[PDB]
Amino acid sequence: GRAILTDRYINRGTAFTMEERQKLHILGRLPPVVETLEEQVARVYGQVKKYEKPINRYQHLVSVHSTNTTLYYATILAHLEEMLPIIYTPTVGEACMEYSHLFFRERGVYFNRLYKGQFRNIMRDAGYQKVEVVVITDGSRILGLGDLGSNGIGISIGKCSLYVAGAGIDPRLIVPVILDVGTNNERYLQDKDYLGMREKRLGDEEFYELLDEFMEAASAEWPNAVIQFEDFSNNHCFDIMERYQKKYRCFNDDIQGTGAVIAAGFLNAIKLSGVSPLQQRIVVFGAGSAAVGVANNIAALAARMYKFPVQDLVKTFYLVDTKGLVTTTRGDQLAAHKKLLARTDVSAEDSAKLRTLEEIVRFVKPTTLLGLGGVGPAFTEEIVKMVMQNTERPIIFPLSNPTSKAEVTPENAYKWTNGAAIVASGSPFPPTTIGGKTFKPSQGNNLYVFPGVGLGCALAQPTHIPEELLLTASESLNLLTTEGDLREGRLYPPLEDIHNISANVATDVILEAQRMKIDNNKKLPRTRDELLAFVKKAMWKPVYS
Amino acid sequence: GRAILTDRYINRGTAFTMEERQKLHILGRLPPVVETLEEQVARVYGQVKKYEKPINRYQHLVSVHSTNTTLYYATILAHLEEMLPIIYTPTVGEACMEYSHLFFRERGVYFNRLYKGQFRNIMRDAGYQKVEVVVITDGSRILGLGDLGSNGIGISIGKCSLYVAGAGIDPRLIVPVILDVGTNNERYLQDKDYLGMREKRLGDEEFYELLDEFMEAASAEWPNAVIQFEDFSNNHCFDIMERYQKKYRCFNDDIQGTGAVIAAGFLNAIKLSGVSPLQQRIVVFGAGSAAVGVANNIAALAARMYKFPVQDLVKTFYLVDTKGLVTTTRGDQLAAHKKLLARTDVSAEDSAKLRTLEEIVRFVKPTTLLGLGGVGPAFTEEIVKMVMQNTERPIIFPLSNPTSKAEVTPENAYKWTNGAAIVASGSPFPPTTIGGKTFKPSQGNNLYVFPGVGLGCALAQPTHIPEELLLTASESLNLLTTEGDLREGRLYPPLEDIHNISANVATDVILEAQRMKIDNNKKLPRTRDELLAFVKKAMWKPVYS
Ligand SMILES: COc1ccc(NS(=O)(=O)c2cccc(NC(=O)c3cc(F)cc(F)c3)c2)cc1
Ligand SMILES: COc1ccc(NS(=O)(=O)c2cccc(NC(=O)c3cc(F)cc(F)c3)c2)cc1
């Protein structure tokens, strides 16, 4: 009766036919209109699209997710490019920050020092079987802005939901986790309505004692699961991966997902440019560990796909930090992560005259500007025009988040080059029309890779996730950009086709794992065509069945 | 486990102690703060009060009601005067009109011609036992504005919730009903997202065939229930009561509740005025059936409480319609409902000179202005000053809904009389300060009577609800205004004390039913002190138990 309607996994609302309503004794529990899923999606979309503020839209979608899980995921997939900034970055962050009450109904798991030694019992008592995907955060944030502490559960809830939408992970087999080790958000510490551990973030030693117990408890109770780290601060995110990458099935989408996605898009940017990889001169504006991680992912992918010597791919890279061009002759002690991309072919005297971007671009004569600075619009009209002198097709990638940090707008880049610029960003931007010719930047969204990595590790059951599976996923994404997409200036397959992309990415990840003999699921086909067809069938679909 | 948390009736959220969380295996399903109900109410109130627009506030409260029923009702009762315009008139009407998706989760029952002959099976299949209160509407509306058709279920949901909050009807024993007989809302008829019967309202004959089947099906399957008609248009609301009042346990709160509440307040206005009931000269501005219903309720209560001859109470009333003073000598055929209050002591020639309110007030010299016009601010400064000439304490009641229709603001009435005016309205208004002296109008809210009528009929099980029980409830409400309240200028007990008011009103209704020997529940005490104590114990309480 009203039990079927109150289970969000099997509830169909108005899609129950008259004759079904009769058999199920729910005649009189619904208005009399009968709708198809398509009609219900158009109705939900209409409801959503009339709300004016993102957080209003998010709140409406949360109520649909609460009542009718199928209709929620069906709505997301029919309008994915539009719904992505509502259901995740950056609306999700505002929702956590100020509307954390929207997450109370959802299936969160909470850990803290008060449950030390009980992490396994908490996981057992959760009563979830054959869990495939666990997103964990501590709410510290990657961009080191707005520590959310316990409210970070909204980030895990949002990320888990993107595995279901993106790769058809079954929504009963995802678990969002908050590991609450305190917060340095001073408003929260004095806020009467903060529900987390009201204390400063624990020191490293107690932090790793709790996270170790979590990783070991998850491996015993959720043995089939992938553990994905989300939105951990820079002080911990890299060290977490060095500590766990080999003993557990885990990855970090911020670090590994981002580089895999940017690399796939950058190589397609190379294909459209005229200028082949060994002919590229690439300014990397910004030299944090993440920016150097992306450069290395690009080198590693170009080596995989084209067997150029990797040393030679590295020499295409000119790294800029806060001081200027990174060189061996400029006279400072370089961070370990910067030595690898330091120029060896630049005198001390030239180094001293290479400090502002304008003069770095004038000397290096780059073919590509990679924006990973997050210090505002450093790619000026004159800097872009200078790149026009060195290539017919400047590759300009303003990837710094959020959009106000970005090095340049797609619109300015397209304008300043008269449509010649090849552009990718993190954020969706509308098309620019230049003399009747339309241009639209490619969105290097992390949704392209983590879902397929998740679905691939769910099926394959690898003992771990070494860099080789992330590289395979990077190449798989590059190779799904068709000749037709490339012809239309797209650097990625279309976002709307995420199920197909995720099936392909998973297939490739599985074959890499099989090849490395780290797979534990022997039921799988070991040839691509059969595997791809099997993977597509294993995927949960947002349709009534 | 997560089953206890997902039942909104027993879920306590953060009020589960640590040791309870352990025993119930929900450690790790909640943030670690433990709160008392009081703390949870202050937190929910804080969340609600930061939203800027009523419909936002309503949407937040709907999510609390969905998760934690106890915390919802606890929040309402701690802030009742503030929450009433959010959870019912007028926010509820806007929610139905444009946000009907907020009602989809709730326990609505839907009837229409397509289920003709199945009304009983629909009620049986609903699987509700010993139902006490059924609110039914057809969405036509009493104020004949914004026909909502099927979306009228939000009105029944809102009204049912006020019986739980107001009188402690158990939330599992209330059933909201929409009888969908079509809609004349032309936007809805052309709206693709309207989910109701897409047709003009049925004719009277098919209307009564469906409503008859509903009344008979309810009497068999919900035998213990009161049936309360809500928000039916004037073409049907009176005729429904004439058709059903004797054969079923039913009332209409718009008609009967309104008059019971206004009468109780008006008599207390008389007590504070100096001018006793036979000395009152009362202008009834507006002469619709509802306005004449209120005048007759006032007469009937004054007769009950003071045994003045009812003919003599009627002669205190000067009825104004669209033409002017209603008299026997003015030369039109008077509607039946107007004959009773027609002046017999006014010549044809005077009648002809008594058409505008200003000159009606100049001739009649009234002590009281009852505003039931709904045609704007007819009680001018000069009209109010004129009443100052005939009494030290003008009784001025602007009761016309919504507040923009009202005959005068409490502020103007208080200003114009220098604090002498005794004021009641339908809507809450803030206090006015006049030379260091504070005044606040009395709110004649229907919440004062229908809950207690509901709780009284739930316990008593009367064969029907004759006018005598409504009169008893009217007197009971008058008599609960204490000497201390009267001393402070209050015409009603305080709204905050609704549980006590509802216990008292129910007790009196039960004794009236026992006295008439129409009660079917023989388990009840038959003396007031014991009955009142029993009634108070039978009431559902918003506390964790
Ligand atoms: C605000 O979030 C939502 C959720 C769902 C929908 N679409 S729908 O699923 O087609 C739909 C439409 C109309 C009524 C119902 N009712 C129930 O699903 C229902 C559930 C119950 F538990 C009890 C009941 F009486 C009705 C469902 C739109 C917005
Ligand atoms: C938006 O609506 C609401 C509802 C409740 C509250 N207050 S509360 O009840 O104290 C509360 C506080 C924090 C977390 C939870 N979680 C669950 O109640 C819960 C329910 C589940 F079904 C599963 C779960 F993990 C947690 C409950 C405030 C606003």
Pair A486, A439: CB distance under 8 Å: no
Which residues, at least 6 apart from A298, have a Cβ–Cβ distance to it below 8 Å?
Answer: A259, A262, A263, A266, A267, A282, A313
Nearest ligand for residue B65 CA: 2
Token output for A132: 């495939």
Q: Residue B199 and residue B179: Cα distance in Å, rounded? A: 14
Which residue bears the tokens 């995907």?
A133
H or E, element range at A395: strand A395-398
CA B335 to chain centre: 27
Set B72, B73, B159, B318: catalytic member: B159
Q: Is A141 annotated as a binding residue?
A: yes
The three-class DSSP label of residue A262 is: helix
Which residues, at least 6 apart from A191, have a Cβ–Cβ distance to it below 8 Å?
Answer: none
Taking CB atoms within 8 Å and a gap of at least 24, the contacts of B385-390 are B385/B416, B386/B361, B386/B362, B387/B361, B387/B417, B388/B416, B388/B417, B388/B420, B389/B365, B390/B281, B390/B365, B390/B366
Q: Are strands A368-371 and A174-179 parallel, antiparallel or unpaired?
A: unpaired
Resolution in A: 2.1
Are B110 and A66 a contacting pair at CB < 8 A? Answer: no
* DSSP code per residue over B228-253: EE-S--HHHHHHHHHHHTTTSSEEEI
Q: How far, in Å, is the centroid of ligand 2 from the Cα of B67?
A: 6
| Closest C-alpha to A268, from A239, A292, A301, A307 | A301
Pair A352, A381: CB distance under 8 Å: no
Q: How far from B161 is each of A66, A67, B104, B477, CA to CA, in Å?
A: 21, 21, 15, 21
Beta strands in A437-531 (DSSP E): 437-439, 442-443
Pair A532, A507: CB distance under 8 Å: yes
Pair B283, B373: CB distance under 8 Å: no
Which residue bears the tokens 């209120």?
B294
Residue B64, ligand 2, Cβ within 6 A: yes
Residue A44, ligand 1, Cβ within 6 A: yes
Q: Are strands A174-179 and A109-111 parallel, antiparallel or unpaired?
A: parallel
Q: Ligand 2 atom closest to Cα of B64? A: 2
Which residues, at least 6 apart from A468, have a Cβ–Cβ distance to it below 8 Å?
Answer: A512, A516
A542: preceding bond cis by omega (within 30 degrees):
no
Which residues, at least 6 apart from B451, have a Cβ–Cβ distance to it below 8 Å?
Answer: B162, B163, B165, B166, B167, B169, B498, B502, B505
H or E, element range at A178: strand A174-179
Q: Residue B474 and residue B275: Cα distance in Å, rounded? A: 21
- Assign a CATH topology to domain B13-255: Rossmann fold (3.40.50)
Measured CA angle at A231 (ends A108, A241), to 5 deg:
105
* CB-based burial label for A527 (10 Å; 0-12, 13-18, 19+): exposed
Spell out which residues of chain B touch residue A29, defining contact as CB-CB under 8 Å.
Answer: 108-110, 126
> Torsions phi, psi of B103, nearest 5?
-100, -5
CA A142 to chain centre: 12
| Closest C-alpha to A410, from A364, A377, A387 | A377
Pair A492, A265: CB distance under 8 Å: yes
Token output for B335: 């509607």
Active site residue A88: yes
| Closest C-alpha to B272, from B419, B431, B472 | B419
Q: Residue A397 and residue B278: Cα distance in Å, rounded? A: 88
Experimental method: X-ray
* CB-based burial label for A4 (10 Å; 0-12, 13-18, 19+): middle
* CB-based burial label for B259 (10 Å; 0-12, 13-18, 19+): buried
Residue B453: what residue type? V
The three-class DSSP label of residue B263 is: helix
DSSP structural state of residue B171: G
DSSP structural state of residue B292: H
Q: What residue of B is the nearest CA neighbor of A25?
A: B125
Q: How far is A539 from chain B (nearest CA, A)?
A: 26
Which residues, at least 6 apart from B140, have a Cβ–Cβ distance to it below 8 Å?
Answer: B147, B152, B201, B231, B232, B233, B235, B236
The closest residue, in CA terms, to atom 11 on ligand 1 is A13
Active site residue B72: no
Residue B5, ligand 2, Cβ within 6 A: yes
Which residues, at least 6 apart from A436, have a Cβ–Cβ distance to it below 8 Å?
Answer: none
Q: Give the up-direction half-sphere exposure of residue B500: CA atoms within 13 A in the CB hemisphere.
A: 10
DSSP structural state of residue B106: S
Q: What residue of B is the nearest CA neighbor of A55?
A: B56
> Torsions phi, psi of B225, nearest 5?
-90, 150
Dihedral (CA of A139, A143, A147, A153) sign: negative
Q: How far, in Å, is the centroid of ligand 1 from the Cα of A473?
A: 39
Taking the CA atoms of residue A322, residue A323, residue A324 and residue A325 in that order, the dihedral angle to the nearest 10 degrees is: -110
Token output for B451: 């809950």
Q: Are strands B432-434 and B437-439 parallel, antiparallel or unpaired?
A: antiparallel
Q: Residue B198 and residue B180: Cα distance in Å, rounded? A: 10
What angle, rounded to 10 degrees, do the helices at A153-167 and A91-98 form?
Answer: 150
Q: Ligand 2 atom closest to Cα of B43? A: 28
> Torsions phi, psi of B169, nearest 5?
-60, 130
Q: How far from A501 is each of A262, A268, A481, A531, CA to CA, in Å?
A: 16, 16, 10, 14
Set A159, A163, A338, A414: catalytic member: A159
Are B196 and A33 a contacting pair at CB < 8 A? Answer: yes
The closest residue, in CA terms, to atom 14 on ligand 2 is A104
Pair A304, A471: CB distance under 8 Å: yes
Set A58, A72, A73, A88: catalytic member: A88
Pair A143, A156: CB distance under 8 Å: no
Ligand 1 site-directed mutation target among A20, A58, A68, A544, most atoms within 8 Å of CB: A68
Q: Ligand 2 atom closest to Cα of A107? A: 25
